[PDB]
Ligand binder design. Structure first.
Ligand SMILES: Nc1nc2c(ncn2[C@H]2C[C@H](O)[C@@H](COP(=O)(O)O)O2)c(=O)[nH]1
Ligand SMILES: [Mn+2]
Ligand SMILES: [Mn+2]
Length: 196
């Protein structure tokens, strides 16, 4: 027997346009497209995924990077299928003029550095933004924030969230799951920011 607070909520699902990129140069130009549509201070939703496979003593490298730039468009950069880490993406991630929002993003910062020697700049942990704007002191997760602020829960099929993200091509379920994590970060930040 469970309480009403424990009831199952509708699932959060991104229904906008998903741009799938799996080639380095394509990704670099896409990143410049993004840079052309934003101004200093603008935010983007961010998340990354990696396969549950270990390589030479540590987690396999980041295989996918997701960026949600608006409520209708998310980019899926399948870096595991690229021959080199796209320069345009590196610049966007290292650009202090663009804020990246997510949960557990500091951890992503360190894994990105170890995996590609990329130094994520101007990232924001939604946990801190939420505690600040919502005047509380909670240990938020992306899911708990989605529930609290949007009245929905995140897709939870473990065989998808813990699937082989380095396997090309991504399935439609993987794209949905991955794009929605980035979308969540964008929407959450947007909604929290307007509060005053
Ligand atoms: N400050 C800092 N934290 C790190 C560094 N490398 C890893 N971490 C963090 C990431 C995790 O939150 C935690 C435990 O590491 P992990 O094996 O990635 O689960 O330590 C680093 O170079 N600096
Ligand atoms: Mn994540
Ligand atoms: Mn994710």
């Amino acid at each position: 027997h469970h309480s009403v607070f424990e009831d199952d909520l509708p699932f959060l699902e991104f229904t906008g346009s998903i741009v799938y990129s799996y080639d380095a140069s394509d990704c670099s130009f896409l990143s410049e497209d993004i840079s052309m549509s934003l101004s200093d201070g603008d935010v983007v939703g961010f998340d990354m995924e990696w396969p549950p496979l270990y390589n030479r003593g540590k987690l396999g490298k980041v295989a996918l990077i997701q960026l949600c730039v608006s409520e209708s468009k998310c980019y899926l950069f399948h870096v595991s299928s690229m021959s080199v880490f796209p320069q345009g993406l590196k610049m966007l991630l290292e650009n202090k003029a663009v804020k990246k929002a997510g949960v557990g993003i500091e951890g992503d910062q360190w894994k990105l550095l170890r995996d590609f020697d990329i130094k994520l700049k101007n990232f924001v942990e939604l946990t801190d933004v939420a505690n600040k704007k919502l005047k509380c002191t909670e240990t938020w997760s992306l899911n708990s924030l989605v529930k609290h602020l949007l009245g929905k829960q995140l897709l939870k099929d473990k065989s998808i969230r813990c699937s082989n993200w380095s396997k090309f091509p991504l399935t439609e379920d993987q794209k949905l799951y991955a794009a929605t994590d980035a979308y969540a970060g964008f929407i959450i930040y947007r909604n929290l920011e307007i509060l005053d």
